[PDB]
Ligand binder design. Structure first.
Ligand SMILES: NC(=O)c1ccc[n+]([C@@H]2O[C@H](COP(=O)([O-])OP(=O)(O)OC[C@H]3O[C@@H](n4cnc5c(N)ncnc54)[C@H](OP(=O)(O)O)[C@@H]3O)[C@@H](O)[C@H]2O)c1
Ligand code: SF4
Ligand code: SF4
Ligand code: SF4
Lengths: 206, 147, 106, 176, 138, 111, 313, 372, 111
C-alpha cells in the first residue's frame, strides 16, 4: 500500500496493554466494556461512581494523564438509555490519549467532575444547556449557549432544527422584541439513503 | 427657490464627506471590517473614521451573525444612534445567515430586528466589494426636506 | 537554579523517599487480595532503588521524569491524596455492581 | 527544542549595569522607538483609492453567481439537482419541466444571496460548467427582494461578465 | 537630488492636460499621475497602465463622465469600465484592446450597463412555475 | 434507590413551595429596579398560570428537575442580570391567535 | 474690542484644521493615506464636520441630569479658549500682573469638563471613565507647578512678557536639561491625544466625556480637548524656546515662533501613535513614586543657583 | 473585542469575582452539521475561527482520513504544512496587533495589516475566496499550486525577516510593556495543568510540551521546529513566545519550499476524492463517482474518532461519531476558547479593570472558537 | 478689560450649543438608554458607592498642594530680603516634603 493505508499499526500492541492493565483491577463498579481501535483507547463507566475513575488516570505513576481537557456528550435515541457523556483525556508527561464514557440515560442526575478538574465545570454547563443533564454537587450551573428565556434544550434530536421560539420581530411594540412567532423558511429534508452496505464485518445479525 | 434646494444638498454633502462606523465585533465579517482600516484598501479619512461609541457615530455596520441573545442588545444600540442613521448589513450572516437560517438561535437577516438601507452580499466580504458599502451609501443620500 | 513550574525547586534530597515510603503503608490496610496493591508496589520499589543508587546526579531526575526532581516531587505529593481516596471509596476491593443494557454498535 | 524567553539578567558589574540604568533613568530606547516610525513616515504608503485604482486579484475568483451558455445559443445548465445537494446553505433551488419538445432544461432557478457562503462548490460540482464564478464586487440593494436572484433572468444577465468568464476558464481547464 | 524632485512634479502637471486639465485630475480624481495609456474602451473610459510606483498597481485608469445616462462627473463608482476587469487592472498581464483578444459569442450584451441600486429599472424577483391549475365552469 | 434527583416524593412538594416564596417576592422588585412593563397585580397572575400548566406530580425525578430549571430562569433576576425587557416576558404580546373552535379554527383553515 | 473675536474664530479653525493633521501625520506614521477624496488633499473635510455634527445631529441623554451635562461643554470651551488671552505672543491681550498663575489656575479649572461629565449620566457606567480621569490628572498637577517654579526662579518672575526677553542668546532647554524632558510628560496631564494621556480615548475602557455626551456636546468637547494640545505646545515654546525677540519688526517673530510650535505640534501626535496606554495604577507610579523625588531634587538645585551665581530679576 | 459579556463584581475598582456570561455568539454549528454530508460540512470549520483558515479543516480532514484509513498524497502533505505555518503568520499577528490595540498602541496594528493584506493574496491565488476556503479536504488538497505562487512565497519570506523584528524594536525593548504586562496572572503550577490550555500558556510558560514534535500529522519531525518556552506565567512572557514563534516560523516555510516532491494533489481513489475535469468528461467510472460524491457522498466507516492538531491558539479537538451513511451524526469542535475563558476566574484575581483587557489579548480569545 | 475679554469668549461658546440644540429636531422616541457605550440593560441601577483603592493618594494631594503654594514666593520674594538668611529657610520646606514622601514609601497603599 502506497496511498491505500494511512499508517501501520506498531504501537497498537503496546496500547492494548493499557486495556488489560485497568481491567486487571477488575471492578464491576468501574470497568464494564473496554474497546480499542485506531491507535486509541475507549472505556465506558458505570453511573454510580465516576469521580473515583477521574481520580484514577490522574496522578498515577504508571499512567500519568492528569489533564482532562475535552468533554463531549452524545445524543442518541436508539438505546433504552439516551445521552452518553464522553470525556477526552490527554497526558503531557506520558504522551497518550484515552477516553472515558458513561452509559446511563442521565435524565436523572449524574456525578460531577468539578472536584477533580477545574475547567470541567464550564464544559458541564454546556451539557446541561444542550442536553439537560444535571450534575450533583456542582458549583454555579449557569447557562452559556442558550437564550435567557429559552424553553427546552436546543440540541436534542427529539425536537426540530428550526426551534419552537426563534423568530424575533420588532413590530408594533415600541421596544419589546417579539418571541412567539414560530414560522421559518423551508429546510429541505433530504430522504437520500443509498442501497447496499458499503462495509463488511460491520453487519450485525438480527 | 434655488438657494433652498442647494442648501439641502449642502447638509447632505456632510454625510457624503464623512461617516463614522461602529466596531461591531460580531463575527468573521468584523475581521474584514478591520481591513477597511488596513492601508491597502482604505477609507481612513477618505470618508470613514473609527471611534466607536453608538452616541457619536452616524453609520452602524452589522458585521456578522446575530442570535436571540444579541437581538435585544443590537436593537437599543440603533436606538442610541442619532436620528440621521444608516445601517449597512455586511455579509451573508447579516443578510439571512451564512449557513444557519434554518437554525434555532440565529435571527434571519437583521431586518427582523433593525431596518437596513445598504446590503453587502459577500461572505469573506472582500475589501474591494466592501468599499461600495460606503461609496453607494453616499450616492444614495440624494434629497432631504422639500418643504 | 529555577524550576519550570511555579513550585520552586528546593534543594532537598531524601524528601522524595519520605512520600514513597508513606504510601506503601497506606496500601496495606484494606486491600490485599485486590490487584491495586500488587501492581502499584512494583513501580514504587523499582523507583525507590534508583534514588538509593544515584548520588544526587541529574541522571536520577532523568529516570522516568526528565524535568528535574521538582516535577517528580509533585507526582509524589498528590500520591498520598489519591491513595487515601482509593481506600475511602470502595471500588478496588469490591466488584458487585450492575451492568448496562446490551447495546454498543453504532 | 526550547528557545527560552528569559534573559537571566544582562547586567553584572560596572559597564553592564550603568548602560542598563541610563535607559531607565532618561529614555534613549524610547527615542530609538520614536525613530522607528520616523523612517516609516519617510517611505511611501501602499494605498489604493477605489473609485480610480483597483486592487490585485486572481484568475480563479468567486463573487456574484452567473450561469453560462454554449457558443451557438442554448442553456448550458441541464437541471440535475446536483448543485442543490452540494450547497451547504441550500441557497440554490431548482425545479425542471420539459422545454416544449426534445430538450429538458430548467423552469425554476433561484440563487438566494440571503444565504450562500461562496464555496465554489457549485462551480466545481457542475458537470456541464453552467455556474462559473466571475470576479464580481458591485452588489448593493434597497431591499432583500432586490438582493436575491430570480428565475435565471438576472443570472442569465451574466453576459456582461461572461466575456471575463471565458478568459478565466482558460486558466481552469488543465488546472493552473 | 532636491532639484530633480521639484522638476518631476512640474513635468507631471505639464504632461497631462495643462491648466484646466490638471484641476480636473485634482478635484475629481484623488491621485494625479501621468504615464502610458491603453486608450480604446467602451462608453469613454481612459484606462492608463505601465507604471512602476508600487506592487499591485496599474496607474490611474480613471472613470468616464456620463457612461450610459447617469450624467455625472463628480460621482463615480465601480460600475464604470466594460467587460475588461479580468485584465490590465487585475489578474492578467495582457492588455484588453492591444494584445489579449476578447472571445466572440453573438449572445453577450453589446452595451455595458451600470448597476441601478436605488434608481428605476433595477433587479426584481419573479415567480417561475404555473402551479396547480384550478377551473370552474357554469 | 436510583436515582436520587434531590428529594423523595413528599419532600419534592415543599421544594417547589420554597422556590415559589422567593419568586413571589421578586415581582414587586422587577418593576422598580428593572422596567414598568405591565403591572404588579397582573404579574402575580402570570406566575400562577405557569405552575398550573406544570402541575402533574407522578415522579420525584420530574419534579426535582423542574426546581433546578426554576433556579435559573427565575434566578435571572435574583442576582440581577440583564434581560433588556425582551427576556423574562413569558406571555405573548404580539401573538393574538387563541382559537379552539372546530367552527373557529376550520374557518381560518389549519391542519 | 476686536482682538478677542480675532482670537476665537481663527483659533477654532486651527482646532478644525487639526483633524487633518490628526490622521495625515498619524496616517503616514502608520503608513496609510489620510485626507484625500473630499478636497484637493482633503482640505474640505475639516470644515465639513462642523456642518455634520451640529446642524443635523440631535441627541440629549436618557436618564440624564438636570441643568448639568449641557453645562459641561460650555465649561469645556469657556475655560480652555480663555487660556489664549494670557499668552505673551508678540503682544498679549491684557498683559497679566502675574502671567503663569492664570495659566496654571484655568488649566486645572479646565479639568472640570471631564469631571461634570461623570454626573452627566446618573448611571454608573459613565462615572468609571470620570473616576479614572481624576487620578490621571490629580497627581500630575503637583509636578506641573514644581517644574514651573524651577524655571521661573532661573528666569524672571511669573510675568509671561519677561520670559521672551530672558532668551536672547540661547534657549532654556540647555540649562534645564532634565526639566525640558519632563514637559513632554507633564503637559499630558489634561485629557489629550497621547500615549500617556487620560481616560478619554477608547482602546480598553469606554470613552470618557463622550459616551454620555451626544454629537453636539460631544463635538464641542473635541473643539476644547484638541485645543489644549496647541496650548501646551505654545506654552513649551515660551518657557523653553525663544531664539529672538525684536520689538521693531513683529513679522520676524511671528514666522519664527510658529515653526518652533509646529515642530512640537507634530511631536504629541508622534507620541500618540507610537506607544500604548500606561494603565491607571502604573501612571500613578511613574510620577509620585519615581519622578516626584527627581523633580524636587532639581527644585532644590534651582534654589541654590541664583545664590551661587547672581540671577535675580 | 466584541461579544464577551464579562459581568464584573468589584469591591471598589479591582476584580474579586469575574463571571463571563458568554456564549452570546452561539451560532449552533453542532446540530446544523448533523443534516449535512462530509463535503457539505467542510467549510463550516473554516468559518468557525476568524483568523485560522488552513489550520482549520486540517483537523477535520485528518479525522476523516483516520476514519477512512486513507493517506493523502506526498505532495499534498507538504502543501498542508506550508499553509499550516502560513496560518500562524495570521493568528500570531492578530495575537499581537489587536492585543496592542486593546491596550492603546495604534502603530503596530497598521504595521502588519499591510503585510496581512498581501498575505490574503496567497489565499486568493490558491483558492477563489479571500478568507475561508474549502481548500483543505479529506482527499488531501483540493487544487494544485499555480506557477505564480512559489516565486511569490520565497520573495515574501525574504523580506519578512526584517519586518517581524521591527515589532520587537517597537514593543519589546520599550519601558511601557516591561512596566505594564509584567506580573499579570502568573499561572504555572499544577493548577495551570488542571485547566488545560494546550497551545500557548503551558507551552508559553512551564511545561516543555507540544504536539508538533510528539504527534506528527502530515510529514513532521523531518521539518525542524523551534518551540519558545518562557520562565514566568506573566502576560509579557506569554507575549514574547508568540513573537519568537513568528521569528521561528520562516524556517518551516523555507524547508517546505526546498522539499517538494512533484506528483499528485488528490488521492487516486475516486470513492473519497473527486476526479479531474478532463478525467470525468471521457471515462465512465470517474463521472459516476463524481456524481455520487455529492447527494450521499463519502460513506464513512462507523466508529468514534478523536483528533487534535496544534492550533496557534490551542487545539482543535474534533470528535466525529460515524454511521453507515455519509452524514456525520454530531461532532464537537473542542477549541481552546472554552478553556481560556474558564481561566478568567483565577487570572483576574487582585487586578484592575485596565489589565483584564490585557488578559483577553494574551489568551487570544477570538470568540469564533467559543461555539461548541 | 479682563471682564469684557472673558465674557465674550464665554457667550460665544454657549451660543454654539444653542445652534446644535434647536436646529436638529424631528422625533424623540423612548430610545435613549442609561448606560450606552456597550449595550444591554443596566445591572447597576442609579448610584452605588464603589469607592476605595486611591483613598490615600488623593488625600495626600490636598496636603501637598498647600506646600507648593507656599513654595510660590521663591522667584518673587527673593529680591529685597537677605539670601543667606533665606537659604536655610527656603530649602527647609523642600527637605521636609522629601521626608514625608520617604514615609510614603513604607507601604504606599492599595494603589
Ligand atoms: N390627534 C390625533 O391623534 C387624532 C385624533 C382623532 C383623529 N385622528 C385621525 O387619525 C389620523 C392620524 O394621522 P397622523 O396625524 O398621525 O398622520 P401624520 O403624522 O400627519 O402623517 C401623515 C403623513 O402623510 C404625509 N402627508 C399627508 N398629507 C400630505 C400632503 N398634502 N402632501 C404631502 N404629504 C402629505 C406626510 O408627509 P410629510 O411629512 O413628508 O409631508 C406625513 O408623513 C388623522 O388623519 C386623523 O383624521 C387623529
Ligand atoms: S457572512 Fe461569512 S465571513 Fe461574514 S460572519 Fe458570516 S460566515 Fe463569517
Ligand atoms: S448548474 Fe450544473 S449541476 Fe446545477 S442543475 Fe445546472 S447543469 Fe446541473
Ligand atoms: S457557492 Fe456554495 S453556498 Fe453559494 S450557491 Fe454555490 S454551493 Fe451554494
Amino acid at each position: 500500500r502506497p496511498t491505500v493505508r494511512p499508517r501501520n499499526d506498531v504501537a497498537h500492541k503496546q496500547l492494548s496493554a493499557f486495556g488489560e492493565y485497568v481491567a486487571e483491577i477488575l471492578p464491576k463498579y468501574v470497568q464494564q466494556v473496554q474497546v480499542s481501535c485506531f491507535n486509541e483507547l475507549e472505556i465506558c463507566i458505570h453511573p454510580d461512581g465516576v469521580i473515583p475513575v477521574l481520580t484514577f488516570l490522574r496522578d498515577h505513576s504508571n499512567a500519568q494523564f492528569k489533564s482532562l481537557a475535552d468533554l463531549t456528550a452524545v445524543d442518541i435515541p436508539t438505546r433504552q438509555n439516551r445521552f452518553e457523556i464522553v470525556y477526552n483525556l490527554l497526558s503531557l508527561r506520558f504522551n497518550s490519549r484515552i477516553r472515558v464514557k458513561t452509559y446511563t440515560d442521565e435524565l436523572t442526575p449524574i456525578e460531577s467532575s468539578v472536584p477533580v478538574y477545574k475547567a470541567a465545570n464550564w464544559y458541564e454547563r454546556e451539557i446541561w444547556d444542550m442536553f439537560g443533564v444535571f450534575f450533583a454537587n456542582h458549583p454555579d450551573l449557569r447557562r452559556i449557549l442558550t437564550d435567557y428565556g429559552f424553553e427546552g434544550h436546543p440540541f436534542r434530536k427529539d425536537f426540530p432544527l428550526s426551534g419552537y421560539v426563534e423568530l424575533r420581530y420588532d413590530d408594533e411594540v415600541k421596544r419589546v422584541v417579539a418571541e412567539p412567532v414560530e414560522l421559518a423558511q423551508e429546510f429541505r429534508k433530504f430522504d437520500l439513503n443509498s442501497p447496499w452496505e458499503a462495509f463488511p464485518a460491520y453487519r450485525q445479525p438480527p | 427657490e434655488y438657494v433652498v434646494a442647494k442648501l439641502d444638498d449642502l447638509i447632505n454633502w456632510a454625510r457624503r464627506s464623512s461617516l463614522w462606523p461602529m466596531t461591531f465585533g460580531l463575527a468573521c465579517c468584523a475581521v474584514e471590517m478591520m481591513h477597511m482600516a488596513a492601508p491597502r484598501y482604505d477609507m481612513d479619512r477618505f470618508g470613514v473614521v473609527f471611534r466607536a461609541s453608538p452616541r457619536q457615530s452616524d453609520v452602524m455596520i452589522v458585521a456578522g451573525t446575530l442570535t436571540n441573545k444579541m437581538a435585544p442588545a443590537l436593537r437599543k444600540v440603533y436606538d442610541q444612534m442619532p436620528e440621521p442613521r444608516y445601517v449597512v448589513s455586511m455579509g451573508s450572516c447579516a443578510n439571512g445567515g451564512g449557513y444557519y437560517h434554518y437554525s434555532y438561535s440565529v435571527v434571519r437577516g437583521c431586518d427582523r430586528i433593525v431596518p437596513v438601507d445598504i446590503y453587502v452580499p459577500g461572505c469573506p466580504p472582500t475589501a474591494e466589494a466592501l468599499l461600495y458599502g460606503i461609496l453607494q451609501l453616499q450616492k444614495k443620500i440624494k434629497r432631504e426636506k422639500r418643504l | 537554579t529555577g524550576l519550570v513550574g511555579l513550585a520552586v525547586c528546593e534543594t532537598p534530597h531524601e524528601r522524595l523517599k519520605i512520600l514513597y515510603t508513606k504510601i506503601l503503608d497506606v496500601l496495606g490496610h484494606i486491600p490485599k487480595n485486590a490487584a491495586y496493591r500488587k501492581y502499584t508496589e512494583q513501580i514504587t520499589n523499582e523507583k525507590l532503588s534508583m534514588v538509593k543508587a544515584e548520588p544526587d546526579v541529574k541522571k536520577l531526575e532523568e529516570r522516568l521524569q526528565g524535568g528535574q526532581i521538582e516535577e517528580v516531587i509533585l507526582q509524589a505529593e498528590n500520591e498520598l491524596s489519591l491513595a487515601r481516596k482509593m481506600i475511602q471509596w470502595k471500588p478496588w476491593e469490591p466488584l458487585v455492581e450492575e451492568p448496562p443494557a446490551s447495546q454498543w454498535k453504532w | 527544542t526550547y528557545k527560552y524567553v528569559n534573559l537571566r539578567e544582562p547586567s553584572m558589574d560596572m559597564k553592564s549595569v550603568t548602560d542598563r540604568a541610563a535607559q531607565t533613568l532618561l529614555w534613549t530606547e524610547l527615542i530609538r522607538g520614536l525613530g522607528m516610525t520616523l523612517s516609516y513616515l519617510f517611505r511611501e504608503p501602499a494605498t489604493i483609492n477605489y473609485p480610480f485604482e483597483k486592487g490585485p486579484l486572481s484568475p480563479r475568483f468567486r463573487g456574484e453567481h452567473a450561469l453560462r451558455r454554449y457558443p451557438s445559443g442554448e442553456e448550458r445548465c441541464i437541471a440535475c439537482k446536483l448543485c442543490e445537494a452540494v450547497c451547504p446553505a441550500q441557497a440554490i433551488t431548482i425545479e425542471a419541466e420539459p422545454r416544449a419538445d426534445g430538450s429538458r432544461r430548467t423552469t425554476r432557478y433561484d440563487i438566494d444571496m440571503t444565504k450562500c457562503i461562496y464555496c465554489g462548490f457549485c462551480q466545481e460540482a457542475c458537470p456541464v460548467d453552467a455556474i462559473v464564478e466571475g470576479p464580481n464586487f458591485e452588489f448593493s440593494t434597497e431591499t432583500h427582494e432586490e438582493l436575491l436572484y430570480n428565475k435565471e433572468k438576472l443570472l442569465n444577465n451574466g453576459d456582461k461578465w461572461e466575456a471575463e468568464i471565458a478568459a478565466n476558464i482558460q486558466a481552469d481547464y488543465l488546472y493552473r | 537630488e532636491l532639484l530633480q524632485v521639484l522638476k518631476r512634479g512640474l513635468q507631471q502637471v505639464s504632461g497631462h492636460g495643462g491648466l484646466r486639465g490638471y484641476l480636473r485630475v485634482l478635484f475629481r480624481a484623488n491621485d494625479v499621475r501621468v504615464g502610458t495609456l491603453v486608450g480604446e474602451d467602451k462608453y469613454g473610459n481612459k484606462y492608463y497602465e505601465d507604471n512602476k510606483q508600487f506592487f499591485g498597481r496599474h496607474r490611474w485608469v480613471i472613470y468616464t463622465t456620463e457612461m450610459n445616462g447617469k450624467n455625472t462627473f463628480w460621482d463615480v463608482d465601480g460600475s464604470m469600465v466594460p467587460p475588461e476587469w479580468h485584465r490590465w487592472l487585475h489578474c492578467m498581464t495582457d492588455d484588453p484592446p492591444t494584445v489579449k483578444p476578447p472571445t466572440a459569442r453573438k449572445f453577450i450584451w453589446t452595451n455595458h450597463k451600470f448597476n441601478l441600486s436605488g434608481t428605476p429599472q433595477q433587479y426584481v424577483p419573479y415567480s417561475t412555475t404555473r402551479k396547480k391549475i384550478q377551473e370552474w365552469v357554469p | 434507590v436510583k436515582p436520587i434527583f434531590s428529594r423523595d416524593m413528599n419532600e419534592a412538594k415543599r421544594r417547589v413551595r420554597e422556590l415559589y416564596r422567593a419568586w413571589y417576592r421578586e415581582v414587586p422588585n422587577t418593576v422598580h429596579l428593572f422596567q414598568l412593563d405591565i403591572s404588579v397585580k397582573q404579574g402575580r397572575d402570570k406566575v400562577r398560570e405557569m405552575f398550573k400548566k406544570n402541575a402533574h406530580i407522578t415522579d420525584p425525578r420530574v419534579v426535582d428537575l423542574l426546581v433546578i430549571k426554576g433556579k435559573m430562569e427565575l434566578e435571572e433576576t435574583i442576582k440581577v442580570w440583564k434581560q433588556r425587557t425582551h427576556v423574562m416576558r413569558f406571555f405573548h404580546e404580539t401573538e393574538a391567535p387563541r382559537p379552539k373552535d372546530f367552527l373557529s379554527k376550520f374557518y381560518v383553515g389549519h391542519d | 474690542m476686536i482682538n478677542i473675536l480675532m482670537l476665537i474664530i481663527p483659533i477654532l479653525l486651527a482646532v478644525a484644521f487639526l483633524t487633518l493633521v490628526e490622521r495625515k501625520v498619524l496616517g503616514y506614521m502608520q503608513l496609510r493615506k489620510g485626507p484625500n477624496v473630499v478636497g484637493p488633499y482633503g482640505l474640505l473635510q475639516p470644515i465639513a464636520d462642523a456642518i455634520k455634527l451640529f446642524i443635523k445631529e440631535p441627541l440629549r441623554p436618557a436618564t440624564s441630569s438636570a441643568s448639568m451635562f449641557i453645562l459641561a461643554p460650555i465649561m469645556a470651551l469657556g475655560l480652555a479658549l480663555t487660556m489664549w488671552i494670557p499668552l505673551p505672543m508678540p503682544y498679549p491681550l491684557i498683559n497679566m500682573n502675574l502671567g503663569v498663575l492664570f495659566m496654571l489656575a484655568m488649566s486645572s479649572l479646565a479639568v472640570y469638563s471631564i469631571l461634570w461629565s461623570g454626573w452627566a449620566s446618573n448611571s454608573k457606567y459613565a462615572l468609571i471613565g470620570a473616576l479614572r480621569a481624576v487620578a490621571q490628572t490629580i497627581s500630575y498637577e503637583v509636578t506641573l507647578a514644581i517644574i514651573l517654579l524651577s524655571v521661573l526662579l532661573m528666569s524672571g518672575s511669573f510675568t509671561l512678557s519677561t520670559l521672551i526677553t530672558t532668551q536672547e542668546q540661547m534657549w532654556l532647554i540647555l540649562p534645564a536639561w532634565p526639566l525640558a524632558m519632563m514637559w513632554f510628560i507633564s503637559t499630558l496631564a489634561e485629557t489629550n491625544r497621547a500615549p500617556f494621556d487620560l481616560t478619554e480615548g477608547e482602546s480598553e475602557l469606554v470613552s470618557g466625556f463622550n459616551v454620555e455626551y451626544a454629537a453636539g456636546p460631544f463635538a464641542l468637547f473635541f473643539m476644547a480637548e484638541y485645543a489644549n494640545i496647541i496650548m501646551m505646545n505654545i506654552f513649551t515654546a515660551i518657557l523653553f524656546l525663544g531664539t529672538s525677540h525684536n520689538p521693531h519688526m513683529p513679522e520676524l517673530y511671528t514666522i519664527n515662533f510658529t515653526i518652533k510650535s509646529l515642530l512640537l505640534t507634530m511631536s504629541f501626535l508622534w507620541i500618540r501613535a507610537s506607544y500604548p496606554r500606561f494603565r491607571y495604577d502604573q501612571l500613578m507610579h511613574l510620577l509620585w513614586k519615581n519622578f516626584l523625588p527627581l523633580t524636587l531634587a532639581l527644585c532644590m538645585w534651582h534654589v541654590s543657583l541664583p545664590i551661587l551665581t547672581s540671577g535675580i530679576p | 473585542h466584541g461579544v464577551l459579556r464579562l459581568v464584573m463584581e468589584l469591591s471598589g475598582e479591582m476584580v474579586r469575582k469575574c463571571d463571563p456570561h458568554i456564549g452570546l455568539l452561539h451560532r449552533g454549528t453542532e446540530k446544523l452539521i448533523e443534516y449535512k454530508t462530509y463535503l457539505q460540512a467542510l467549510p463550516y470549520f473554516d468559518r468557525l475561527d476568524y483568523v485560522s483558515m488552513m489550520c482549520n479543516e486540517q483537523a477535520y480532514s485528518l479525522a476523516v482520513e483516520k476514519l477512512l484509513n486513507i493517506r493523502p498524497p506526498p505532495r499534498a502533505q507538504w502543501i498542508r504544512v506550508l499553509f499550516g505555518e502560513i496560518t500562524r503568520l495570521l493568528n500570531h499577528i492578530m495575537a499581537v496587533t489587536t492585543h496592542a490595540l486593546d491596550i492603546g498602541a495604534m502603530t503596530p496594528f497598521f504595521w502588519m495589516f499591510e503585510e496581512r493584506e498581501k498575505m490574503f493574496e496567497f489565499y486568493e491565488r490558491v483558492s477563489g475566496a479571500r478568507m475561508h476556503a474549502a481548500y483543505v479536504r479529506p482527499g488531501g488538497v483540493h487544487q494544485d499550486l499555480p506557477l505564480g505562487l512559489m516565486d511569490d512565497i520565497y520573495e515574501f519570506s525574504k523580506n519578512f525577516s526584517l519586518r517581524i523584528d521591527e515589532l520587537e524594536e517597537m514593543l519589546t525593548n520599550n519601558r511601557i510593556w516591561r512596566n505594564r504586562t509584567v506580573d499579570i496572572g502568573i499561572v504555572t503550577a499544577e493548577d495551570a495543568l488542571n485547566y488545560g490550555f494546550s497551545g500557548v500558556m503551558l507551552r508559553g510558560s512551564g511545561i516543555q510540551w507540544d504536539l508538533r514534535k510528539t504527534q506528527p500529522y502530515d510529514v513532521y519531525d523531518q521539518v525542524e521546529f523551534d518551540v519558545p518556552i518562557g520562565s514566568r506565567g506573566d502576560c509579557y512572557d506569554r507575549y514574547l513566545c508568540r513573537v519568537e514563534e513568528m521569528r521561528q516560523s520562516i524556517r518551516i516555510i523555507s524547508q517546505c519550499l526546498n522539499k517538494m516532491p512533484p506528483g499528485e494533489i488528490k488521492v487516486d481513489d475516486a470513492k473519497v476524492s473527486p476526479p479531474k475535469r478532463a478525467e470525468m468528461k471521457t471515462s465512465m467510472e470517474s463521472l459516476i463517482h463524481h456524481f455520487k460524491l455529492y447527494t450521499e457522498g463519502y460513506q464513512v466507516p462507523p466508529g468514534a474518532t478523536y483528533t487534535a492538531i496544534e492550533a496557534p491558539k490551542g487545539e482543535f479537538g474534533v470528535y466525529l461519531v460515524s454511521d453507515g451513511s455519509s452524514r456525520p451524526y454530531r461532532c464537537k469542535i473542542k477549541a481552546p476558547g472554552f478553556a481560556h475563558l474558564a481561566g478568567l476566574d483565577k487570572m483576574s484575581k487582585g487586578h484592575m479593570l485596565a489589565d483584564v483587557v490585557a488578559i483577553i489579548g494574551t489568551q487570544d480569545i477570538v470568540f469564533g472558537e467559543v461555539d461548541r | 478689560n479682563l471682564m469684557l475679554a472673558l465674557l465674550t469668549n464665554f457667550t460665544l461658546a454657549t451660543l454654539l450649543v444653542i445652534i446644535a440644540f434647536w436646529l436638529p429636531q424631528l422625533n424623540v422616541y423612548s430610545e435613549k438608554t442609561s448606560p450606552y457605550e456597550c449595550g444591554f440593560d443596566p445591572m447597576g441601577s442609579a448610584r452605588l458607592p464603589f469607592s476605595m483603592k486611591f483613598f490615600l493618594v488623593a488625600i495626600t494631594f490636598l496636603l501637598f498642594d498647600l506646600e507648593i503654594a507656599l513654595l510660590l514666593p521663591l522667584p518673587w520674594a527673593s529680591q529685597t530680603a537677605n539670601l543667606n538668611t533665606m537659604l536655610t529657610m527656603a530649602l527647609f520646606l523642600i527637605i521636609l516634603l522629601a521626608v514625608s514622601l520617604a514615609y510614603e514609601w513604607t507601604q504606599k497603599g492599595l494603589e
